[PDB]
Design a protein around this ligand. Structure first.
Ligand SMILES: [Zn+2]
Lengths: 142, 142
């Protein structure tokens, strides 16, 4: 099916009553309005948004009586940088921006894709980080 | 006089007992080990450091019985960006680094030179800032 407009948004997944058939895309796909991929349950989806609205993690593409076809990003290896102070956050964020590395700044953490050549930078700045598996939940601005 | 090595450092200016004849330089000069300028009281100073040690604001170049010749940066117009949260700090710092703008991240503030085309960026990020006159007290790393 061809999707030209979003028809809803999942507020709180745990509270959703309908079955959710997810369309899992790449982080970069959230900044696109054109893409084609199959949902986890096998439905062919071609997103061709007829507007400039940016896709949001959790957006509903199609809704039937008992199912929601929604979009989210894939689970992937990431570095969860945890600055302990306003200064640590600023300095760490600055260095990341300076090397043009994609990231998400949520609350007091900096999410960046796993990148070996990046650890030497975090240590250099002296910020504590942890490796993990997460889904980027916001399209990268830029 | 030619200065090839630092001979002291001013801890706390208010507590210093000796007269301080300041050598006022540009922010960028703190990353140099070679420069020539006159002190406020008229002494010709040629800094030619015989080492890789970076100059520090407050470094003492020469000390006599009653006077200290020390270095500091000039007072200039700057923007004092004040992020209210860890997220504001990170996002603001990221954008600044992304456009390769020189800055100093001290505590919970971001010091950047006054730049008109930069206000639209701060507002875009939604961070509170204030215009002021300050001396950059740390050499810019990079
Ligand atoms: Zn660049």
């Amino acid at each position: 099916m061809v999707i030209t407009k979003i028809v809803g948004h999942i507020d709180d997944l745990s509270h959703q009553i309908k079955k959710v058939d997810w369309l899992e895309v790449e982080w970069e796909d959230l900044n696109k309005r054109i893409l084609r991929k199959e949902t986890e349950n096998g439905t062919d989806i071609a997103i061709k948004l007829e507007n400039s609205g940016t896709l949001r993690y959790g957006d509903v593409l199609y809704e039937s009586d008992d199912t929601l076809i929604a979009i989210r990003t894939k689970l992937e290896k990431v570095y969860v940088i945890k600055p302990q102070t306003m200064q640590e956050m600023g300095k760490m964020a600055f260095e990341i921006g300076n090397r043009h590395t994609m990231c998400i700044i949520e609350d007091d953490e900096i999410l960046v894709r796993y990148d070996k050549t990046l650890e030497k930078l975090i240590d250099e700045v002296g910020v504590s980080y942890e490796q993990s598996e997460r889904r980027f939940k916001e399209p990268f601005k830029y």
